[PDB]
Amino acid sequence: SVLFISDLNLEAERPDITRAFLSFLDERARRAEALYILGDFFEAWIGDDGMDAFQRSIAQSLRQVADGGTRIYLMHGNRDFLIGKAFCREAGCTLLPDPSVIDLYGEPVLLMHGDSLCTRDEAYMRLRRWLRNPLTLWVLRHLPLATRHKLARKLRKKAVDIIDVTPEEVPRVMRGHGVRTLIHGHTHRPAEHPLDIDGQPARRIVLGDWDRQGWALEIDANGHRQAPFPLL
């Protein structure tokens, strides 16, 4: 089977989420063929050069799972888009771009964090565009850590208040990628939504966020299920 999770927002000051995630690795991800993490894995990320002990402990725990044979894939979210190849090498995972199409039991499946669909938030679309620009990334690379923290603070300054996807964007992007299944996170509204693309049934599955309870979507060749479980 294959596991999909997102929107954990890991941080040292939420040890309930940390304990839930680490046990999830031990009890479920170890036995899975693959684990996909679709963005907002960490609550913040200043860059791989600035990893602290907490963030390195999570790389170590991923790496134990990867060394045991489970393939792990990590995709950026709005909070942790500066995660890099160095972190992924430590963790033994593969960094997937947003968007990515994978083969899932013989079907092409589109994966995204989900914020790029939320196009009604115009201010955020403009900021996201700047943050993802290679030139921005280059300049960020060349800023000292302190100044990057200064910028994070400046930029920093419930689900209902997170803008949800633009409905029409969903079939548009699924059609363009040649898929009938999309899995994403970001909106904190876990669900499965059917839709129709050019007369064929399709589905959009939204992953749950871990602020109150853990979530995982598990898929095998015979079906799938997303359900919550307690953090403690």
Swiss-Prot record:
Alphabetically ordered keywords of this record: Cell inner membrane, Cell membrane, Hydrolase, Lipid A biosynthesis, Lipid biosynthesis, Lipid metabolism, Manganese, Membrane, Metal-binding
Any one Gene Ontology molecular-function term assigned to this protein's record: UDP-2,3-diacylglucosamine hydrolase activity
Entries under Pfam families matching the protein: Metallophos
Record-listed E.C. numbers: 3.6.1.54
Cofactor(s) listed in the protein's UniProt record: Mn(2+)
Iron among keywords: no
Note describing how the cofactor binds: Binds 2 Mn(2+) ions per subunit in a binuclear metal center.
Broad class of the protein's primary localization: membrane
InterPro entries with a match to the protein in the record: Calcineurin-like_PHP_ApaH, LpxH-like, Metallo-depent_PP-like, UDP-diacylglucosamine_Hdrlase
Chain positions recorded as Mn(2+) 2 binding sites: 40, 78, 113, 186
Pathway this chain belongs to: Glycolipid biosynthesis; lipid IV(A) biosynthesis; lipid IV(A) from (3R)-3-hydroxytetradecanoyl-[acyl-carrier-protein] and UDP-N-acetyl-alpha-D-glucosamine: step 4/6
Mode of membrane association: Peripheral membrane protein
Cell compartments where the protein resides: Cell inner membrane
Reaction catalysed by this enzyme: UDP-2-N,3-O-bis[(3R)-3-hydroxytetradecanoyl]-alpha-D-glucosamine + H2O = 2-N,3-O-bis[(3R)-3-hydroxytetradecanoyl]-alpha-D-glucosaminyl 1-phosphate + UMP + 2 H(+)
Binding-site positions, substrate: 78-79, 121, 186
UniProt cross-references to SUPFAM superfamilies, sorted A to Z: Metallo-dependent phosphatases
Residue numbers binding Mn(2+) 1: 7, 9, 40, 188
Group of enzyme by EC: hydrolase
GO BP of this protein: lipid A biosynthetic process
Cellular-component GO terms for this entry: cytoplasm; extrinsic component of plasma membrane
Function per UniProt: Hydrolyzes the pyrophosphate bond of UDP-2,3-diacylglucosamine to yield 2,3-diacylglucosamine 1-phosphate (lipid X) and UMP by catalyzing the attack of water at the alpha-P atom. Involved in the biosynthesis of lipid A, a phosphorylated glycolipid that anchors the lipopolysaccharide to the outer membrane of the cell. Can functionally complement lpxH deficiency in E.coli.
Similarity section: Belongs to the LpxH family.
Swiss-Prot/TrEMBL domain comment: Consists of two domains: a catalytic domain homologous to metallophosphoesterases (MPEs) and a helical insertion domain (HI domain) inserted in the middle of the catalytic domain.
Protein name: UDP-2,3-diacylglucosamine hydrolase
Lineage per the UniProt record: Bacteria, Pseudomonadati, Pseudomonadota, Gammaproteobacteria, Pseudomonadales
